[PDB]
């Protein structure tokens, strides 16, 4: 598991004959379960920031690059 996939509830569809029809039923079920995961993500999405705070690896805010010297240096070096 990666990201928050281990905090979400969804089933894994498994086939029985291996033919083209099972690949289709599973391709239906994987999309119903994707709808389920989307609903859970919408309901449980928290508040906060959307990027890592290590601005040595992430771009500064456009209001901070035009107001702080180190933020402008980080922007210049990153871009």
């Amino acid at each position: 598991p990666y990201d928050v996939y281990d905090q979400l509830d969804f089933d894994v569809p498994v086939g029985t004959r291996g033919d083209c029809y099972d690949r289709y039923c599973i391709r239906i079920e994987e999309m119903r379960q994707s709808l389920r995961i989307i609903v859970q993500c919408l309901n449980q999405m928290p508040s906060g920031m959307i990027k890592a705070d290590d601005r040595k690896l992430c771009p500064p805010s456009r209001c901070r690059m035009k107001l702080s010297m180190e933020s402008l240096i980080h922007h210049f070096e990153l871009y």
């Binding site: 702080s68 010297m69 180190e70 933020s71 240096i73 980080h74």
Partner: protein, 244 residues
């Protein structure tokens, strides 16, 4: 390990050679080397702003501060002579906290004009700020500013970006031989200039563009033409004179 930049240490005699521990590594240096030079022999490259190997030592910027065991306060490695048995420490929290303090002080009155600075992709200030500096600035008050002065048709001058390392003054006094440039004033209001309106007439006056670690001194003919990353570097020789 090898010295930084393949530097060659000339031992006049094997007898006059002290031993130091740069990071727990045994390093042999002649009597007379400084802590910074001893670290350079041991492959460790210390940050520097005001130290130039061809200019006299002047511990202004306080950026090369390291930790010495028998020292209550960090020492300027550029000026501190190496002693036998001395244990230097460069990657300790003390040396770090000193370096992010000094970078924070240096980037406090510096203008927010990296995009228009001709030193954009080749500045020592921002390169060391990324590496040895911090991430967030705590300064919000009004910065200082100075007017720009004409030094001739070769050196473009934007003195708001000066970090006051006095390398240009030392070069003019020692290497160029034409004493026309100096540090004027006292305190945060100190400025580099000629006081009177005069132009740099030395034949070696253009070398102040390179010794300047920031974009305070830049070439006027090569103003805004291109950035360093756009340029292909060819190692060639001179044909203008017989020096080559």
């Amino acid at each position: 390990r090898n010295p930084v930049g393949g530097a060659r240490v000339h031992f006049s005699n094997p007898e006059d050679a002290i031993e130091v521990f740069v990071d727990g590594y045994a390093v042999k240096v002649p009597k007379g080397f400084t802590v910074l030079q001893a670290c350079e022999v041991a492959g460790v490259d210390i940050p520097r702003f005001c130290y130039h190997s061809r200019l006299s030592i002047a511990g202004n910027c306080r950026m090369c501060l390291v930790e010495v065991e028998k020292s209550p306060k960090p020492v300027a490695s550029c000026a501190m002579p190496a002693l036998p048995g001395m244990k230097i420490k460069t990657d300790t929290p003390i040396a770090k906290k000193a370096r992010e303090g000094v970078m924070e002080f240096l980037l406090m009155n510096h203008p927010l004009d990296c995009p228009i600075c001709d030193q954009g992709g080749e500045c020592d200030l921002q390169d060391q700020s990324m590496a040895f500096g911090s991430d967030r600035g705590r300064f919000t008050e009004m910065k200082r500013s100075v007017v720009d002065k004409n030094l001739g048709p070769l050196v473009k001058t934007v003195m708001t970006r000066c970090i006051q390392c006095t390398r240009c003054v030392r070069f003019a006094s020692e290497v160029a031989g034409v004493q026309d440039l100096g540090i004027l004033g006292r305190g945060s209001g100190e400025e580099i200039g000629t006081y009177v309106e005069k132009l740099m007439t030395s034949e070696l006056s253009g070398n102040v563009i390179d010794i300047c670690p920031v974009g305070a001194l830049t070439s006027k003919p090569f103003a805004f033409k291109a950035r360093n990353w756009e340029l292909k570097a060819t190692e060639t020789i001179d044909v203008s004179d017989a020096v080559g």
